[PDB]
Design a protein around this ligand. Structure first.
Ligand SMILES: O=C(N[C@@H](Cc1ccccc1)C(=O)NCc1cc(=O)[nH]c2ccc(Cl)cc12)c1ccc2[nH]c(=O)cc(O)c2c1
Ligand SMILES: [Cl-]
Length: 238
């Protein structure tokens, strides 16, 4: 996260840190708890991941220092990537992780509500992006979960800012005209969370951008409301 601040413990209790054990253990991506056995994240996080067996999900984490070899984690039973996903910049950057055990909800870890299809008209004015990513384009993974308030931009505006890309209605953008605050490397798969009427929704998934925090380069997020049928369909049994 560029231009953000340290979070309070438990203010983002849907936020997970997804780790890989290969070759040694490190943070890979963000993700959101959406159900007792379900993390929602970005499809591009699994480039070159051959097996779900090298994945570990940590919940209720503020600082990465909390993760040691004795720290408990959720194993991943199944990675489900959207079958139309080819790569982040051309959309469909959405994946589900089916955990091996279920999350026991608490003030430290519980789920975020998916957007309603009826919410497509709501103008959100209280949106935050969170993560352990870089504080600038060349940098490293941060210890403490950062947060940044960032206004959504319209798809017409965002399209103007990426004339070499096709910014579709299944993408949503957010950023300042002058830059300054943004997601950056390490943040992807994490939530773009918008509070409306005292209720938080999972409006987007951190996907990509050109650079981090540049002027006239909004962050691009998976537009979650566009995938509520896909999520329902994929999270059923057998
Ligand atoms: O590059 C990373 N993530 C990329 C995506 C990715 C994920 C997994 C493997 C390869 C690449 C990212 O966050 N991508 C999102 C992203 C990148 C960027 O440069 N600018 C942005 C501007 C706006 C928005 Cl919304 C997103 C971005 C990434 C992930 C985990 C890491 N762990 C480490 O221990 C050390 C790292 O250096 C590291 C880097
Ligand atoms: Cl472009």
């Amino acid at each position: 996260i560029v231009g953000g601040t340290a979070s309070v413990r438990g203010e983002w209790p849907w936020q997970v840190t997804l780790h890989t054990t290969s070759p040694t253990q490190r943070h890979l991506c963000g993700g959101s708890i959406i159900g007792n056995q379900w993390i929602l994240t970005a499809a591009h996080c699994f480039y070159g991941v051959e097996s779900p067996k090298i994945l570990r999900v940590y919940s209720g984490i503020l600082n990465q220092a909390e993760i040691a070899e004795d720290t408990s984690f959720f194993g991943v039973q199944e990675i489900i990537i959207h079958d139309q996903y080819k790569m982040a910049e051309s959309g469909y950057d959405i994946a589900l992780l089916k955990l091996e055990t279920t999350v026991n909800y608490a003030d430290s870890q519980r789920p975020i509500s998916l957007p309603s299809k009826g919410d497509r008209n709501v103008i959100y004015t209280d949106c935050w992006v969170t993560g352990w990513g870089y504080r600038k384009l060349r940098d490293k993974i941060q210890n403490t979960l950062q947060k940044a308030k960032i206004p959504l931009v319209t798809n017409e505006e965002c399209q103007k800012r990426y004339r070499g890309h096709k910014i579709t209605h299944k993408m949503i953008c957010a950023g300042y005209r002058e830059g300054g605050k943004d997601a950056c490397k390490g943040d992807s798969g994490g939530p773009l969370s918008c509070k409306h009427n005292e209720v938080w929704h999972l409006v987007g998934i951190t996907s990509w951008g050109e650079g981090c925090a540049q002027r006239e380069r909004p962050g691009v997020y998976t537009n979650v409301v566009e995938y509520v049928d896909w999520i329902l369909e994929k999270t059923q049994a057998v």
